[PDB]
Symmetry: D2
Subunit: 146 residues, 4 copies
């Protein structure tokens, strides 16, 4: 993540319009629907057998809202991503064994969801800037592996 | 592709609302802005140094339309993708040396511009159907490396 | 696979020197030691916490032999890979939810143990032929996700 | 890269037996042969049209020896990988546009080459340790992208 003042401000502005309740559950729901192998991490959540099932699942909705929260907290502290996400690095890596590529797939399901929700604001350059913030947050979460 | 009738027809239905001019250019434009290393393939196109520079660049837009037209045709030969993208596989593999990964990144830039242009239509289920078609077209255009 | 007679016969020839017992176990063992997140799929096997622990573990070795035997059979149906790995595709995709990426990582752990066991035979050209077969078997075992 | 004293010593010992002249050219030669799209970065080098052509190419041989050198220098300074490879980050990223995945493919072609050359020494644990050193050196070389 190497953001200029102009990039930080444009992602900041974008993010200020994001409804965290509805974008997080939709982002996590698209990962389980589109990339169906991710469902093995969330079977405790219940029935995920159809799109309708996934998107209706309140455990999904609630957890997704927990994810975006953590991410906004990441955005308030670009300068200390490693400090901010250190404990989530151990949960995901040492306890949950979340495969590194899934962080990238979740990143992808978040950018498709922000584009459908904020079409005017999700320009090629805000896309580029969020893509390297999301890339560095994913580097920090898989750091118990290297 | 393991498209059920519903999946295939939902893809067929969203695709008819796509404005090829508008979407092919932005899709290729987001590839070049977000994943800058891909610019080495399109040096020929002239100025690509700023988001505005690659987005409005007329070669980008032209090419964008050509990429989507070949995708439209592939969509109508869903049962025979291998056969339809056969000469494009030699071009990309043998003549152009395009990394397999870049086809995955372009597919992702396309799902993002589609989400932004058709938000109401871009439901998690058609996003999943479209990702499968996109993945199949990618394994076929990458055929001549394996 | 776009195996020329020479490629197919060179693969056929190296494969006949492979000691399945010795190589299947070490291949799966290197997956689990090098990419630890894969251990979540084989928790059933008991102790996998140390390199020595996963390497000598008898379930690892047993399974290793089973994975290579299915690969031997796939090799002798090079022309019909889709057909031969068909029931193993449902198992890995629908029942086990194995990430597509893990098939690429296992293929890599196998090329490394093969290099080590057959160094004189593991020439860049048979390494390339073997990587193509491995890639084709992977796109087929991943069929039921696309 | 999080190496214990025991890991550092075991990679150190391994590396002390590596013939840098012959392992670097073989590692770079396997990347161009096996992953043929990488040849677009090295066409100035000449004829790379066959395995025989690639492996005989002295520009390949010499460059490969330049790569491993840089890598041994990386190994002498784990504690400052970012300081050591900062200029190579700008050459590869801003001047050469080397796609991030190719760093991982080169890593892979180096581990297959060390296994064929030092079979006794290339144990599952030295493999695991070199894999995360190589992973972090590749993170540092693609850092102009994030
Ligand atoms: C890339 C951004 C990610 C962030 C910021 C993140 C954040 C979180 C947070 C805040 C928690 C702890 C709170 C809770 O227990 O609900 C958590 C739990 C968890 N995360 Fe992640 N996570 C990320 C990616 C992933 C990915 C890619 C997966 C796997 C597909 C994953 C799987 C899980 C699971 C299984 C739990 C436990 C859920 C439960 O039992 O309620 N996470 N994550
Ligand atoms: C989604 C898959 C893709 C499709 C359907 C596709 C389609 C096309 C088509 C239709 C042409 C043929 C132009 C002609 O000869 O008439 C072409 C050319 C080309 N493609 Fe692709 N392509 C795809 C992905 C890529 C990717 C990922 C790259 C590299 C980043 C790429 C780079 C090129 C280049 C450099 C040319 C020729 C440049 C020029 O027009 O002067 N293509 N592609
Ligand atoms: C190179 C491709 C692979 C082949 C040819 C292969 C082959 C096999 C075979 C033959 C079985 C069937 C056992 C039976 O029902 O009789 C099996 C089971 C299984 N495979 Fe794979 N497999 C491959 C890759 C993977 C990967 C990448 C993973 C995950 C890291 C995986 C995880 C499993 C698991 C967990 C089982 C069942 C566990 C048990 O034996 O109790 N496989 N595989
Ligand atoms: C992962 C380890 C890598 C290291 C340590 C590394 C190191 C080097 C070094 C030391 C040079 C500068 C000296 C010279 O000009 O010969 C160089 C040049 C270069 N590297 Fe890399 N490199 C790495 C990966 C890659 C990869 C993956 C590619 C692309 C497939 C690549 C492509 C090039 C090219 C094209 C040059 C210029 C060669 C010439 O014109 O002579 N490098 N690299």
């Amino acid at each position: 993540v190497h953001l200029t003042p102009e990039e930080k401000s444009a992602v900041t502005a974008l993010w200020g319009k994001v409804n965290v309740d509805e974008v997080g559950g939709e982002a996590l729901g698209r990962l389980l629907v589109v990339y169906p192998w991710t469902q093995r991490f969330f079977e405790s959540f219940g029935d995920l057998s159809t799109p309708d099932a996934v998107m209706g699942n309140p455990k999904v909705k609630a957890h997704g809202k927990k994810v975006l929260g953590a991410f906004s907290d990441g955005l308030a502290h670009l300068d200390n991503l490693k400090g901010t996400f250190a404990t989530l690095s151990e949960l995901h890596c040492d306890k949950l064994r979340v495969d590194p590529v899934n962080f990238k797939l979740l990143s992808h399901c978040l950018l498709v969801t922000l584009a459908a929700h904020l079409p005017a604001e999700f320009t090629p350059a805000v896309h580029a800037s969020l893509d390297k913030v999301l890339a560095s947050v994913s580097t920090v979460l898989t750091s118990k592996y290297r």
